[PDB]
Amino acid sequence: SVSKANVPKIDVSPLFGDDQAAKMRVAQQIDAASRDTGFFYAVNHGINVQRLSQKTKEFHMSITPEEKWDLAIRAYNKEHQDQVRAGYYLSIPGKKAVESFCYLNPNFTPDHPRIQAKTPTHEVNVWPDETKHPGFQDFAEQYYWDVFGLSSALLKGYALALGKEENFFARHFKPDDTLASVVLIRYPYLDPYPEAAIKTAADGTKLSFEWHEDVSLITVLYQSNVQNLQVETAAGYQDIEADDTGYLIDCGSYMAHLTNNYYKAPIHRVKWVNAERQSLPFFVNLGYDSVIDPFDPREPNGKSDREPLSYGDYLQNGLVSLINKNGQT
Numbered sequence: 562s563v564s565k566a567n568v569p570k571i572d573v574s575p576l577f578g579d580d581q582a583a584k585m586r587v588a589q590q591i592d593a594a595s596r597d598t599g600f601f602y603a604v605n606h607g608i609n610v611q612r613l614s615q616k617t618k619e620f621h622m623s624i625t626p627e628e629k630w631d632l633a634i635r636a637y638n639k640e641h642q643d644q645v646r647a648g649y650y651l652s653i654p655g656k657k658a659v660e661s662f663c664y665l666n667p668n669f670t671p672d673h674p675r676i677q678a679k680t681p682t683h684e685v686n687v688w689p690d691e692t693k694h695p696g697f698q699d700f701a702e703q704y705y706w707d708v709f710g711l712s713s714a715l716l717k718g719y720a721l722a723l724g725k726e727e728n729f730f731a732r733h734f735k736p737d738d739t740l741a742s743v744v745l746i747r748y749p750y751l752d753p754y755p756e757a758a759i760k761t762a763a764d765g766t767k768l769s770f771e772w773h774e775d776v777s778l779i780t781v782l783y784q785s786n787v788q789n790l791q792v793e794t795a796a797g798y799q800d801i802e803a804d805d806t807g808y809l810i811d812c813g814s815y816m817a818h819l820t821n822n823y824y825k826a827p828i829h830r831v832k833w834v835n836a837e838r839q840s841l842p843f844f845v846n847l848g849y850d851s852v853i854d855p856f857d858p859r860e861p862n863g864k865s866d867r868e869p870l871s872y873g874d875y876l877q878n879g880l881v882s883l884i885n886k887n888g889q890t
């Protein structure tokens with residue numbers, strides 16, 4: 562009935578080092594995975610994912626409805642017109658099980674020129690009361706830069722895998738302007754589970770989130786140990802096995818655009834599973850004005866006539882389109 566995706570485990574630790582041949586061997590594995598199912602697990606990544614999951618669980622399980630309204634994005638609180646991305650994403654008991662908290666670049670302050678300029682997709686993060694959530698903001702901001710660092714190394718692997726110099730992507734991935742986001746998603750156990758929160762796929766599978774390509778350059782995802790993701794292949798959807806020690810990596814549609822679809826953005830979905838679990842993506846977005854010139858690694862001259870795409874416009878459109886297609890999360 563349902564087969565299992567080949568998701569290789571790639572030791573990415575050489576990407577933090579200066580052994581250039583070893584980096585090329587990592588890049589080959591990234592190339593192979595990106596041309597197959599489009600997913601791999603980054604292992605030996607150096608991030609303390611036990612603390613990540615512990616601190617995230619403490620937050621999800623202690624925040625109150627009052628705090629959720631106070632932090633809610635505009636979709637749940639009309640008072641918060643500036644919160645299109647960052648803030649709390651409320652569940653709706655009986656209708657919607659998932660809930661989450663999204664935050665952006667901590668360097669987006671009122672001082673920041675993009676905030677001053679009111680450029681779309683830039684927002685100042687909102688946070689709960691420190692005394693009610695001691696150490697949470699400090700943990701979350703540290704994690705942002707921890708996973709930023711891992712992502713910068715992965716981008717070197719992707720650049721080398723495509724035959725470019727290692728900073729081809731990472732040079733656009735900067736702490737002062739990155740539009741990257743962290744989302745701390747809670748998927749709850751519920752008995753009874755609300756039928757309204759379960760979607761039925763065309764092929765009959767019960768889903769929590771429908772098929773989509775990622776709005777990102779790449780996505781760097783930690784999940785707890787409950788299998789749920791499926792990737793689409795020509796022979797149908799295949800189960801991605803869980804690994805709560807590694808990061809699940811895949812290309813987003815910005816990468817597919819700039820590589821002339823040589824590295825596709827894999828289509829994937831979330832199966833419905835009645836289990837308490839965590840889904841913690843880091844979406845590797847560039848700066849608002851970042852443009853990468855497309856190329857076609859299939860051609861000798863590498864030439865593409867695809868239009869260079871400004872990352873900010875891509876992100877603003879992608880996030881709205883994803884809400885329209887797959888629902889406000």
Ligand SMILES: CC(C)[C@@H](NC(=O)[C@H](CS)NC(=O)CCC[C@H](N)C(=O)O)C(=O)O
Binds near residue numbers: 890
């Ligand atoms: C693990 C993923 C598939 C996760 N889904 C997701 O994160 C889905 C699909 S990639 N992503 C989104 O809704 C986009 C959130 C963007 C964020 N608010 C921002 O402003 O940057 C899940 O578990 O549902």
Ligand SMILES: [Fe+3]
Binds near residue numbers: 773774775829
């Ligand atoms: Fe996704």
